């Protein structure tokens, strides 16, 4: 009685081959059993009504059967019993692997400037347990990883935190994960685009650099902000805007300018994190006589 055992691996759902080397073949019965000791093939004849198992080579050198659609319920010792006197076993132990699923990044709570960001990353099924690395703008971030085994498979998590100003918004964070079921130095990756809120800022830009009587001027208020601000209010100190002024959204349109329409106009925009205000000093030029420069 002799027993020899090779090892044999699959990625889940995959396809595995079981070679049963036979040294010199008289012709004697060859049986193959699943790990529940149930006989797949008694010699050539199929003898388990499960059609994922197909028989490939039965040649004076070896026997080969193929399991397609591997599952975690297919691990175990695959017995290759050659029935001579005496009998001789080959036990191919199948180990099925789950390559980590795409990582999933979430933020705990909204990124606010000055405040902080709490980013998490979760592979829910890995076998072996994954390794989670964080990269941001091609440098690696240090995380706090920890897994748990829900059967044969591992859910791993890793949670990084850091500080954000308004520059950091729109920026990309990469969680990558890798283990054995993937080629060495490969990985699955997932890119999370930051979202930092910030207090707004406004600034006015004018249609013309020199405004003369009887012209039509359009000021434009150049707001930024996250959330972006949704209303703009236009003002002229404690005074009415020129009649015929058009304050529509983010533009004041002054037409037929006359020298009494002068003054400093302001646009003013706010979101939940602050206010902003900008200030254009209007000056209507004429052919009259001016103080010297």
């Amino acid at each position: 009685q002799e027993v020899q055992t090779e090892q044999v691996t699959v990625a889940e759902g995959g396809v595995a081959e079981i070679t049963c080397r036979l040294h010199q073949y008289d012709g004697s019965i060859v049986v193959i059993q699943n790990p529940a000791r149930q006989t797949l093939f008694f010699n050539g004849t199929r003898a388990l009504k499960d059609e994922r198992f197909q028989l490939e080579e039965f040649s004076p050198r070896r026997v080969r059967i193929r399991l397609s659609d591997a599952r975690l319920e297919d691990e175990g010792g695959y017995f290759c019993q050659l029935y001579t006197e005496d009998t001789h076993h080959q036990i191919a132990t199948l180990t099925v692997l789950v390559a980590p699923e795409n990582p999933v990044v979430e933020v705990r709570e909204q990124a606010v400037e000055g405040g902080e960001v709490e980013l998490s990353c979760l592979v829910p099924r890995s076998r072996p347990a994954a390794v989670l690395r964080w990269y941001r703008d091609r440098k690696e971030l240090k995380g706090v990883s920890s897994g748990q085994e829900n059967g044969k498979v591992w859910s791993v998590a890793s949670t990084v935190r850091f500080r954000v100003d308004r520059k950091d918004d729109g920026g990309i964070v990469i969680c990558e994960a890798q283990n054995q079921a993937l080629p060495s130095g490969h990985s699955k990756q997932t890119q999370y685009v930051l979202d930092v809120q910030y207090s707004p800022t406004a600034r006015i830009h004018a249609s013309q650099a020199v405004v003369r009587e009887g012209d039509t001027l359009v000021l434009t208020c150049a707001v930024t902000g996250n959330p972006r601000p949704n209303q703009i209010r236009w003002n002229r100190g404690q005074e009415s805007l020129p009649e015929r002024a058009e304050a529509v959204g983010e533009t004041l349109t002054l037409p037929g300018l006359v020298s009494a329409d002068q003054g400093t106009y302001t646009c003013e925009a706010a979101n939940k994190h602050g206010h902003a205000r900008a200030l254009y000093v209007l000056v209507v030029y004429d052919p009259g006589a001016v103080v010297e420069a």
Binding site: S28, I29, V31, Q33, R37, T39, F42, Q81, Y83, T87
Partner: peptide, 18 residues
Amino acid sequence: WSNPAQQTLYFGEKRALR
């Protein structure tokens, strides 16, 4: 039929264990 050692005896009319 298998024996108490999960070792096949007869599969149909084809003898297994010698």
